[PDB]
Design a protein around this nucleic acid. Structure first.
Ligand SMILES: [Mg+2]
Ligand SMILES: [Mg+2]
Ligand SMILES: [Mg+2]
Ligand SMILES: [Mg+2]
Ligand SMILES: [Mg+2]
Ligand SMILES: [Mg+2]
Ligand SMILES: [Mg+2]
Ligand SMILES: [Mg+2]
Ligand SMILES: [Mg+2]
Ligand SMILES: [Mg+2]
Ligand SMILES: [Mg+2]
Ligand SMILES: [Mg+2]
Ligand SMILES: [Mg+2]
Ligand SMILES: [Mg+2]
Ligand SMILES: [Mg+2]
Ligand SMILES: [Mg+2]
Ligand SMILES: [Mg+2]
Ligand SMILES: [Mg+2]
Ligand SMILES: [Mg+2]
Ligand SMILES: [Mg+2]
Ligand SMILES: [Mg+2]
Ligand SMILES: [Mg+2]
Ligand SMILES: [Mg+2]
Ligand SMILES: [Mg+2]
Ligand SMILES: [Mg+2]
Ligand SMILES: [Mg+2]
Ligand SMILES: [Mg+2]
Ligand SMILES: [Mg+2]
Ligand SMILES: [Mg+2]
Ligand SMILES: [Mg+2]
Ligand SMILES: [Mg+2]
Ligand SMILES: [Mg+2]
Ligand SMILES: [Mg+2]
Ligand SMILES: [Mg+2]
Ligand SMILES: [Mg+2]
Ligand SMILES: [Mg+2]
Ligand SMILES: [Mg+2]
Ligand SMILES: [Mg+2]
Ligand SMILES: [Mg+2]
Ligand SMILES: [Mg+2]
Ligand SMILES: [Mg+2]
Ligand SMILES: [Mg+2]
Ligand SMILES: [Mg+2]
Ligand SMILES: [Mg+2]
Ligand SMILES: [Mg+2]
Ligand SMILES: [Mg+2]
Ligand SMILES: [Mg+2]
Ligand SMILES: [Mg+2]
Ligand SMILES: [Mg+2]
Ligand SMILES: [Mg+2]
Ligand SMILES: [Mg+2]
Ligand SMILES: [Mg+2]
Ligand SMILES: [Mg+2]
Ligand SMILES: [Mg+2]
Ligand SMILES: [Mg+2]
Ligand SMILES: [Mg+2]
Ligand SMILES: [Mg+2]
Ligand SMILES: [Mg+2]
Ligand SMILES: [Mg+2]
Ligand SMILES: [Mg+2]
Ligand SMILES: [Mg+2]
Ligand SMILES: [Mg+2]
Ligand SMILES: [Mg+2]
Ligand SMILES: [Mg+2]
Lengths: 126, 263, 188
RNA sequence: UACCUGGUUGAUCCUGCCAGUAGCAUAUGCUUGUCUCAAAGAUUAAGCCAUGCAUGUCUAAGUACGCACGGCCGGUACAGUGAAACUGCGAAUGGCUCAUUAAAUCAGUUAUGGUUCCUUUGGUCGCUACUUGGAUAACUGUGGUAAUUC
RNA sequence: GACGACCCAUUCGAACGUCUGCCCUAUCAACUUUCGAUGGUAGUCGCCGUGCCUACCAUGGUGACCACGGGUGACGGGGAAUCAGGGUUCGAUUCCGGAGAGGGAGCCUGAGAAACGGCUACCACAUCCAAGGAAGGCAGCAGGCGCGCAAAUUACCCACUCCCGACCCGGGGAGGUAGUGACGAAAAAUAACAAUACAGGACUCUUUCGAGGCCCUGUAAUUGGAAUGAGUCCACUUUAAAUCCUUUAACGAGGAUCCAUUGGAGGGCAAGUCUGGUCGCAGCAGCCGCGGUAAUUCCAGCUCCAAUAGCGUAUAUUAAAGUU
RNA sequence: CCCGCCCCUUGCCUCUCGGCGCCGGCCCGAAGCGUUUACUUUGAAAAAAU
């Protein structure tokens, strides 16, 4: 195939239970590579799993060909579940998002600020 | 308005030797109150993501520091904007490495790994001398420490080598003509040389001379001298190039000859 | 509001003071024809980047010799000029910079080298090819006709590796017509 | 780029100005394919303002008898999640505008040996006791006014 | 280990004070004082120095080196425009300092406020009413009226930078993101190339004529085939979630469109002593000047000029101005 | 055009406490500053952005 991975400025971070590096993808002729299709080749490179691997960034140059991004590879799964930002755990579902606007949260708080002892119906009856 | 103390610090107004960029966002970390001045400090957040690259965003620094990994002079600091400064000795146990904050010769801090049999003592510069209640003599160093019952020959402007588990000063270098010195203020920042002189204008900012290992001399103010050695023999370890402050016509030649464009 | 932005920007040309002057209009029109540029402004850029070099050269030449500043910055300016093929290493001194003409910065343009190194039929054909992404410098497509070619980049200019002119699928015209033989001349 | 050109006379030489000329920044007219940056209710009226939002906060570690949910049956300091409420802290930073104001404000330079300082950092902590007192909120229940974070 | 706490130091400051530094005005030449103005002694008060304020005493202090009064479309500075050399004009505006939340005044709490997203009262406005009473402050973010020559959406989100909190967890119109945007700045498309025919020159040959001819330009008819994005549009990528740009499949060019405009053509000042119309009218013209039946200047066609994704006009200002 | 010589050359003094020499005795660096300014040259010290 044309696609190829090459790492750069590798660093083994023990203070956060991961190894981080920069990723080069030499993929001429084709569109950008999907993130899924990258992370499994990193696995085969480091012999762990396509589950403790996270990748992001990935801007493509002018002219086609290369792209460069950032990648991290955790030791356990749960260390990733602790040390990752939540939205990056959401990308490949491992977390979920809730309340449907900033307005509703704001305006509930302002209605509740005008009652004492039990804020009651403003939450319990919406 | 200003009716009380401020608590934010704008990115442009921040100190220069922090070497911060311009286009991330409007603020800068604003070191918290501590033993080191606001312009002379280096917050712990700037040491872990702008220098050692260990973290990437502010939250990663916060969750590195919370796990109690980082030690500043033995103690375990959990505040990410803590003001580390000249002669402080960061220790990262989980990795097994240590550092000493010393000015690099362009006038900024740089990483300087030290051997773990050295990161047990740090130097301090005497700032005050007074006799407390009942006749006890005291001491105040540059990083706010207070030593009770010091030897009755240590005076102002001297240097003292303490231990990090006891305080309790061990050795002391006396400021006079012929000892080593590192300069910690103004134009000549991070240069080393023998003191070689001291003039005294009573009531205003006594001046001091120095002399490098290549004849170069450079005056300064006495409140900016920091003795680091008995003479020609620095007690603490030194960064590469040892405060020699080569000119730009030399910096170009070394850049060209070494051809340090890769590795 | 405070905001995380660079407002720093600058102009790169200066209009001439005499707006209708024949000695000027005919020379600039000559320079547009001989190198195939688009406006007058494409010439006033080159005039600016030369008239600004000629101020640093002069202000150095009015320092005294042996100066630190003059030495350092002169050795830096001559290096920068030599490195783009505007000056000869057999000159390498400030009193020669004042002898450079505008038609040496114009000569080092990629449009000029793509014609003069043989890859195109004319100085106008070259500007079309560059703008159509047919040419490559060193493992890198480029699309800007005004790109200035550094001295040792010179012999890298060649046709792109994804392009009809040398190892590439035929374009959307050579393919629409070869299909007219199998979709318009076989059963159509 | 250290530059001028038209205009008093029948013509000439001058003083001398009006006009042309190039940049800049506010408004406005005609016109408008691509792509990277990005200023924008200052000028007049520091004039007036409908609606929404812009400041809140809990850890192993101040106070838990809400059955609100709760497990292996027990609180025998008392489990455990924990609404509310007392307590502490913050609200004096940030944001907006340029009316005032000419030795004032502000800048560089110096001084507190003439003062105060939440917090952080280091000192300092020895001239009924196996543990004292009464009284409030949330909660239960009865209410007033058209109306309010009464 | 968490918490609290006396005092000392340190830190972040704050406050007061020294030297020098300011636009225009003489149609402002004397000003200042028991309603403290300059000084001394003792106190009051205050965080401390001090006419800061009270009692007694002295009669001083400032000015042609511009005091004092008046004006400022005056908040100061880092800086901005133009600039041979010297200078002139601007600085409400993202960094630093100051001052203010309709106008004036008084205070609670606190380490810190004379605080207005705090309270009390008067002045001016304005809302609700059962006429007893109650409530208010957008020169925060959007939005609306008004004013005017003059200025964007009642969108999204704490992911980035940082701040606050009892805090690894909550919150943030600070801040980030997208929308409107010809204020302005950078890069840059609207045609490239052959054949053929005419056109023109160096060269060859011919005494020439003439012919051969290589190098270019237009210009025609077609063509001739090739090239590529502007667009339509699957996916990946982007990001908090999206958009944009970049990366890629599929469609997408024959020129009568996938159409370049704005101002000129006497001089200054690049470009027509063409044709039709008007007749000192209508109009043009920054200035000189055009038009009275034969207009290089008006109205229009044609052609030509300058800059070009931009160009014209009004106004303030700088160089020209050795016309400060 | 750094030293000392025609009378002067950092202009002297007189010391004293502490280091530099010789074999106690004697020799030379520091303390006083040179009558004062303006000028010129060098150092120190001066936020970032522009
Ligand atoms: Mg403020
Ligand atoms: Mg205020
Ligand atoms: Mg902080
Ligand atoms: Mg006359
Ligand atoms: Mg005449
Ligand atoms: Mg004029
Ligand atoms: Mg113009
Ligand atoms: Mg943008
Ligand atoms: Mg602007
Ligand atoms: Mg206004
Ligand atoms: Mg409202
Ligand atoms: Mg709990
Ligand atoms: Mg509990
Ligand atoms: Mg409370
Ligand atoms: Mg408080
Ligand atoms: Mg605004
Ligand atoms: Mg005021
Ligand atoms: Mg005045
Ligand atoms: Mg006044
Ligand atoms: Mg003053
Ligand atoms: Mg100051
Ligand atoms: Mg001052
Ligand atoms: Mg606190
Ligand atoms: Mg303490
Ligand atoms: Mg008195
Ligand atoms: Mg007194
Ligand atoms: Mg008098
Ligand atoms: Mg008098
Ligand atoms: Mg006055
Ligand atoms: Mg001003
Ligand atoms: Mg004003
Ligand atoms: Mg200039
Ligand atoms: Mg300003
Ligand atoms: Mg104004
Ligand atoms: Mg504004
Ligand atoms: Mg400000
Ligand atoms: Mg100040
Ligand atoms: Mg108002
Ligand atoms: Mg408080
Ligand atoms: Mg107030
Ligand atoms: Mg406020
Ligand atoms: Mg209120
Ligand atoms: Mg009220
Ligand atoms: Mg308000
Ligand atoms: Mg508003
Ligand atoms: Mg209107
Ligand atoms: Mg506008
Ligand atoms: Mg309007
Ligand atoms: Mg955040
Ligand atoms: Mg949060
Ligand atoms: Mg905002
Ligand atoms: Mg533009
Ligand atoms: Mg078009
Ligand atoms: Mg495109
Ligand atoms: Mg997504
Ligand atoms: Mg036209
Ligand atoms: Mg006209
Ligand atoms: Mg005409
Ligand atoms: Mg003309
Ligand atoms: Mg002409
Ligand atoms: Mg007629
Ligand atoms: Mg006629
Ligand atoms: Mg005619
Ligand atoms: Mg002028």
């Amino acid at each position: 195939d044309t696609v190829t991975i090459r790492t750069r400025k590798f660093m083994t971070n023990r203070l956060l239970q991961r190894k981080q590096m920069v990723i080069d993808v030499l993929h001429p002729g084709k569109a950008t590579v999907p993130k899924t299709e990258i992370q499994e080749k990193l696995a085969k490179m480091y012999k762990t799993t396509p589950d403790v691997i996270f990748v992001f960034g990935f801007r493509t140059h002018f002219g086609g060909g290369k792209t460069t991004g950032f990648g991290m590879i955790y030791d356990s799964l749960d260390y990733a579940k602790k040390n990752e930002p939540k939205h990056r755990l959401a990308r490949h579902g491992l977390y979920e998002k809730k309340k449907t606007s900033r307005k509703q949260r704001k305006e509930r708080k302002n209605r509740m600020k005008k009652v004492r002892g039990t804020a009651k119906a403003n939450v319990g009856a919406g | 308005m200003a009716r009380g103390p401020k608590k934010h610090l704008k990115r442009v107004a921040a100190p220069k030797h922090w070497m911060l960029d311009k286009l991330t966002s409007v603020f800068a970390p604003r070191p918290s109150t501590g033993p080191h001045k606001l312009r002379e400090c280096l917050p712990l957040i700037i040491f872990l993501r702008n220098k050692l690259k260990y973290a990437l965003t502010g939250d990663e620094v916060k969750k590195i520091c919370m796990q109690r990994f980082i030690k500043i002079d033995g103690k375990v600091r959990a505040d990410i904007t803590y003001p580390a400064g000249f002669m402080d000795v960061i220790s990262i146990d989980k990795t097994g490495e240590n550092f000493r904050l010393i000015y690099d010769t362009k006038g900024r801090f740089a990483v300087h790994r030290i051997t773990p049999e050295e990161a047990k003592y740090k130097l301090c510069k005497v700032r005050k001398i007074f006799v407390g209640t009942k006749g006890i003599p005291h001491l105040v160093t540059h990083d706010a420490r207070t030593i009770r019952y010091p030897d009755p020959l240590i005076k102002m402007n001297d240097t003292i080598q303490i231990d990090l588990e006891t305080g309790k000063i061990t050795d002391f270098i006396k400021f006079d003509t012929g000892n080593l010195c590192m300069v910690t203020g103004g134009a000549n920042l991070g240069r080393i040389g023998v003191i070689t002189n001291r003039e005294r204008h009573p009531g205003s900012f006594d001046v001091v001379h120095v002399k490098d290992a290549n004849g170069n001399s450079f005056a300064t103010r006495l409140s900016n001298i920091f003795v680091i050695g008995k003479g020609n023999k620095p007690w603490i370890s030194l960064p590469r190039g040892k405060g020699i402050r080569l000119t730009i016509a030399e910096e170009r030649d070394k850049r060209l000859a070494a051809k340090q464009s890769s590795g | 509001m405070p905001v995380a932005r660079s407002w720093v920007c600058r102009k790169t040309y200066v209009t001439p003071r005499r707006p209708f002057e024949k000695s000027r209009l005919d020379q600039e029109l000559k320079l547009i024809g001989e190198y195939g540029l688009r406006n007058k402004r494409e010439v006033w850029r080159v005039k600016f980047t030369l008239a600004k070099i000629r101020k640093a050269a002069r202000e150095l030449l009015t320092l005294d010799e042996k100066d630190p500043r003059r030495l350092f910055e002169g050795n830096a300016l001559l290096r920068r000029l030599v490195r783009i093929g505007v000056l000869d290493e057999g000159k390498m001194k400030l009193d020669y910079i004042l002898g450079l003409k505008i038609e040496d910065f114009l000569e080092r343009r990629l449009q000029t080298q793509v014609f003069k190194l043989g890859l195109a039929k004319s100085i106008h054909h070259a500007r079309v090819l560059i703008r159509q992404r047919h040419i490559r410098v060193r493992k890198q497509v480029v699309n800007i006709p005004s790109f200035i070619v550094r001295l040792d980049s010179q012999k890298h200019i060649d046709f792109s590796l994804r392009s009809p002119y040398g190892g590439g699928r035929p374009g959307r015209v050579k393919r629409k017509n070869a299909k007219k033989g199998q979709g318009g001349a076989g059963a159509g």
